[PDB]
Design a protein around this ligand. Structure first.
Ligand code: HJ4
Ligand code: HJ4
Lengths: 247, 248
């Protein structure tokens, strides 16, 4: 079987919010439900990441580092895709029973962040992104940030990253053809992945409740998910090589 | 020692939010902090209620019922007092490091509820409520709702309620004097306690995530705080005698 179809099978079922819409709107209840959903999304993200080809073959300290940097990248990109595939970048589709209109979030500080999240769906809409392109792109967001000093299994990471870069290229070829059109498209899609660093920096700034200097050296996925969930870690930019396709 | 000074000693130390105000405002972070604070306030409310004279002498099924009805009454009244004593009913003073301005909560659904909470502080400000009056009044809010069929230790409850009514009367006398002025004041303070039923009905409607018909008969009473916190229970009005000093 193809590497895209392996990424397609491991992609989880959509989570439902468990939210009553027939009752009158309570912003307290929405935010409570979002927090419960976000915790469940981190369980699903870690489970997904461990099923990615190549990821298991890395060192466990490398595996737990990548997920610590990349959890918000994955959730916010997937949010972009769902919002794109449902409403066409008008509504924030957190779950099928928890769709938030932008005009509902009237507060400037909340509105500002909804724009950052809607930017991802807008660009997915603008570039008319394929489901196979999304799958490769999402895998590259797991592999988008590295420690400054470096990983333990650094040479294997590079080879894992470059094969998923090639797999994005393969997903571009299936659209139509022409070397000019493909190169330009590969530019556009990598420019979006680059811009996710600036998107996530805002979203993390908004919600983080613990600042750490370096990554925590965790071994086990049951521990990891609880560490991310309870304290919502922001790791300092000085010790992260944020990988970019373009300067 | 006097019954007011017993209520004064058992009154807990003010909880701090653990919130950084020097950073720019995130409404996500405020609401996260409020949820953590609200859980801690329920631990304190149950601990307080068990230390009230008379309350321990009731049946455990009566004790667990009163706290199930009255938890939001206690927290929202205390919120009113802190907001009164700190900002003079302009700001919602959830904790000393988590003071929320009404103009900050621009959303209509959030604004509407902030007005309900600010009403309590406004009335405490208007009536110039003493700290001893607040303490008796807050004790009566624990004893403000009863099941329709009734409590097990119902005659003892009535005597516990009526002594705390008399203790409010004693706290009124310490202000100045005159039988006319006291009676009128006792009217005004009981009218506030009556209006807390309508306040709490709104606040519960806004935040409840489990609707139950009757009160839960809990088996390990220490579990109560966790039951209130995790599910945020609203109990149906049909099976509650909401006690009022004056009917409507
Ligand atoms: C337990 N943890 C750790 C957690 C808690 C909650 C979440 C939210 C709320 C976040 C953090 C938001 C980013 C800024 C935020 O604070 C917000 C918000 C508004 C809407 C403006 C209220 C984020 C976007 C990605 C996402 C996708 C989704 O499918 C559902 C959740 C989700 C969120 C994420 C993680
Ligand atoms: C899970 N638990 C056990 C819990 C969680 C959180 C709380 C809040 C938030 C509530 C429910 C609010 C009433 C409507 C609400 O949802 C709100 C709100 C706005 C500000 C509009 C965002 C309530 C008022 C009393 C109170 C006093 C206080 O010292 C601190 C908290 C507090 C609250 C109460 C209980």
């Amino acid at each position: 079987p193809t590497l895209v179809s392996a990424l397609e099978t491991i992609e989880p079922e959509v989570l439902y919010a468990g939210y009553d819409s027939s009752v009158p709107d309570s912003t307290w209840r929405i935010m409570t439900t979002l927090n419960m959903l976000g915790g469940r999304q981190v369980i699903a993200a870690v489970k997904w990441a461990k099923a990615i080809p190549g990821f298991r073959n890395l060192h466990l300290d490398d595996q737990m580092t990548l997920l610590q940097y990349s959890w918000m990248y994955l959730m916010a990109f997937a949010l972009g895709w769902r919002s794109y595939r449902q409403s066409s970048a008008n509504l924030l589709c957190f779950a099928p029973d928890l769709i938030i209109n932008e005009q509902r979030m009237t507060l400037p500080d909340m509105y500002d962040q909804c724009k950052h999240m809607l930017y991802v769906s807008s660009e997915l809409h603008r570039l008319q992104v394929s489901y196979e392109e999304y799958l490769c792109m999402k895998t590259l967001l797991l592999l988008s940030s590295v420690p400054k000093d470096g990983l333990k299994s650094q040479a294997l990471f590079d080879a894992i990253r470059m094969t998923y870069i090639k797999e994005l290229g393969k997903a571009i070829v299936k659209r139509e053809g022409n070397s000019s059109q493909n190169s330009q498209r590969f530019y556009q899609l990598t420019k979006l992945l680059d811009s996710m660093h600036e998107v996530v920096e805002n979203l993390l700034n908004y919600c983080f409740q613990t600042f750490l200097d370096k990554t925590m050296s965790i071994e086990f996925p049951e521990m990891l998910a609880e560490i991310i969930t309870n304290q919502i870690p922001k790791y300092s930019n000085g010790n992260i090589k944020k990988l970019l396709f373009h300067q």
